[PDB]
Amino acid sequence: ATPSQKYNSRSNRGEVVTSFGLAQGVSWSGRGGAGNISLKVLGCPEALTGSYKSMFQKLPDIREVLTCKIEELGSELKEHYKIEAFTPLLAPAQEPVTLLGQIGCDSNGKLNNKSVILEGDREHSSGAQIPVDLSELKEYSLFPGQVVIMEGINTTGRKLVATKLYEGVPLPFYQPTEEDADFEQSMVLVACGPYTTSDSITYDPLLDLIAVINHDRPDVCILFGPFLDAKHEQVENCLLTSPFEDIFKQCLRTIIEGTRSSGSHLVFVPSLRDVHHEPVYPQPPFSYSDLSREDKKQVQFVSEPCSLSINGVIFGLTSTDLLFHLGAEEISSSSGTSDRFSRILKHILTQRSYYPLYPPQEDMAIDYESFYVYAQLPVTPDVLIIPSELRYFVKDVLGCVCVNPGRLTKGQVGGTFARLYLRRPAADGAERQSPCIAVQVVRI
Amino acid sequence: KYYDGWLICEEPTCRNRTRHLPLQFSRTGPLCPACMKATLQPEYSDKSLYTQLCFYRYIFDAECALEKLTTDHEKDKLKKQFFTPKVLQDYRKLKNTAEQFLSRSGYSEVNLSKLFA
Numbered sequence: 382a383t384p385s386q387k388y389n390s391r392s393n394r395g396e397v398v399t400s401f402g403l404a405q406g407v408s409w410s411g412r413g414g415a416g417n418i419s420l421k422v423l424g425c426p427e428a429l430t431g432s433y434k435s436m437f438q439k440l441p442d443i444r445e446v447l448t449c450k451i452e453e454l455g456s457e458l459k460e461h462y463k464i465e466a467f468t469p470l471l472a473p474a475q476e477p478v479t480l481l482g483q484i485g486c487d488s489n490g491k492l493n494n495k496s497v498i499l500e501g502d503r504e505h506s507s508g509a510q511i512p513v514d515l516s517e518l519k520e521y522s523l524f525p526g527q528v529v530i531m532e533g534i535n536t537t538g539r540k541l542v543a544t545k546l547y548e549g550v551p552l553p554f555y556q557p558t559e560e561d562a563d564f565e566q567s568m569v570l571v572a573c574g575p576y577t578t579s580d581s582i583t584y585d586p587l588l589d590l591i592a593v594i595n596h597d598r599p600d601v602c603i604l605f606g607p608f609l610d611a612k613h614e615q616v617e618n619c620l621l622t623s624p625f626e627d628i629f630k631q632c633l634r635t636i637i638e639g640t641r642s643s644g645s646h647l648v649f650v651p652s653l654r655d656v657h658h659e660p661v662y663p664q665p666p667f668s669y670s671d672l673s674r675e676d677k678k679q680v681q682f683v684s685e686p687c688s689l690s691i692n693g694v695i696f697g698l699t700s701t702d703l704l705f706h707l708g709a710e711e712i713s714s715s716s717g718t719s720d721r722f723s724r725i726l727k728h729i730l731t732q733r734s735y736y737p738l739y740p741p742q743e744d745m746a747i748d749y750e751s752f753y754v755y756a757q758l759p760v761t762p763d764v765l766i767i768p769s770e771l772r773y774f775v776k777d778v779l780g781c782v783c784v785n786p787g788r789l790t791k792g793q794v795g796g797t798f799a800r801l802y803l804r805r806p807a808a809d810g811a812e813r814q815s816p817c818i819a820v821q822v823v824r825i
Numbered sequence: 826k827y828y829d830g831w832l833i834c835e836e837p838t839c840r841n842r843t844r845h846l847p848l849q850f851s852r853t854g855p856l857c858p859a860c861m862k863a864t865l866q867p868e869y870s871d872k873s874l875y876t877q878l879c880f881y882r883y884i885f886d887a888e889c890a891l892e893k894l895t896t897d898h899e900k901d902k903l904k905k906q907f908f909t910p911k912v913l914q915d916y917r918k919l920k921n922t923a924e925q926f927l928s929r930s931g932y933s934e935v936n937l938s939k940l941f942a
């Protein structure tokens with residue numbers, strides 16, 4: 382059998398490729414359905430439940446959304462740093478000034494050091510644009526759409542020579558209650574698609590994942606899409622003999638039935654590459670009605686992005702490749718010895734959105750009126766799950782454990798998945814006490 | 826394509842193409858940042874997207890394409906010849922594909938409650 386032959390002849394099976402936290406063996410296991418498991422949807426009104434509202438947009442509403450974004454972030458930054466007042470962009474001033482705006486490029490290409498512009502807010506600058514000169518700036522990190530506060534010289538009123546870049550400030554963490562400290566140790570498994578090789582329809586990696594889930598019996602399993610990839614060669618050439626919907630239900634039934642004996646809860650997160658679903662961000666939950674009474678207690682459908690409380694632990698779930706988009710259009714002063722991923726993650730956490738980049742990638746549909754109400758970070762998450770096409774990693778940035786397990790299938794060979802332990806320690810201590818105690822990125 | 830957001834200037838000598846929506850608006854719409862006296866306009870409007878989906882629903886609508894025939898005799902002659910009940914069901918499945926996307930989205934819907942009250 383030539384389909385998935387290279388995958389089926391893998392020898393690296395079961396290998397552990399990354400570990401973080403406290404050293405653990407290979408006998409990773411949960412209690413299954415034992416104990417109390419709390420699964421809650423959190424945040425601005427809860428992570429979208431209905432189908433959607435619209436698919437036509439009004440420019441004077443996008444204008445309002447962008448303006449409000451800038452004003453809110455600027456007001457909070459002004460409160461934190463205790464600055465006196467903001468100066469209009471076009472007003473000449475011989476003394477140093479403090480401007481508030483958002484970063485952008487002056488053309489349709491990639492942003493660089495020479496093409497930076499700053500666009501002001503409506504209240505102060507009435508949406509004016511000025512070039513920014515970064516010759517005299519020592520350390521900086523900039524991407525388009527970043528709401529920023531600069532301090533510099535602007536003598537002529539047509540160009541700003543930036544001299545200081547104020548650092549961003551993140552949101553406060555979640556405040557645990559008395560109940561949340563009484564929860565016991567739990568194990569969580571995380572996987573992201575695609576779940577089949579690029580040359581086959583067999584879905585072998587899915588079966589391997591189901592076998593692993595049955596063996597380990599974790600407490601929660603979070604699965605990201607796509608389940609029917611829109612970029613697959615057979616999908617995009619329309620060689621399939623069945624409707625997309627039927628194939629999707631087939632896959633979903635295979636997943637649900639195969640992990641019935643485990644007793645582990647299942648969470649399904651949609652993707653923008655799901656062919657049968659709506660290709661607009663943010664996405665509503667999947668549609669599935671063929672569930673018995675038993676299965677309604679173990680299967681839960683959430684949106685994208687989502688904020689999920691698992692036993693008093695906050696998880697930030699997003700399927701979009703934000704790391705691969707932000708990193709492709711981000712400029713920085715230091716390139717020799719610096720961590721790109723940590724820097725991008727710091728931008729994500731301090732910008733207070735699930736997608737800070739504006740304008741988005743070329744193939745990325747965003748509805749801003751719903752993006753404003755359904756895609757904001759409520760608090761700084763305890764664990765942030767960010768699947769991406771880059772190499773797998775687990776990093777502790779700003780008190781948040783950011784995990785990238787990668788895709789379950791990469792080209793014609795298998796990928797990786799991730800497992801975590803969670804247990805919240807005692808209330809008092811040295812301020813931050815991460816409820817996540819051990820992470821491991823493992824081969825499939 | 827519609828959600829890409831490409832804006833193009835209205836002046837024939839400027840024709841500035843951009844994906845970034847300026848926050849400076851004139852009376853008609855966004856104000857062009859290259860020539861400061863003009864308005865940007867969508868390259869692919871919502872009316873073009875709406876008309877495109879209405880076209881797909883129209884090339885598979887055998888129900889409306891039969892009442893459009895002039896004589897009642899010809900409509901009977903081919904309804905019994907090609908348009909079997911099995912054939913009519915096939916066109917209904919292709920028609921409903923374009924109708925799902927048109928159902929609740931794109932404001933082909935008009936809300937009278939907001940319009941009058």
Ligand SMILES: [Zn+2]
Pocket residue numbers: 834835836839840841857858859860863
């Ligand atoms: Zn123009």
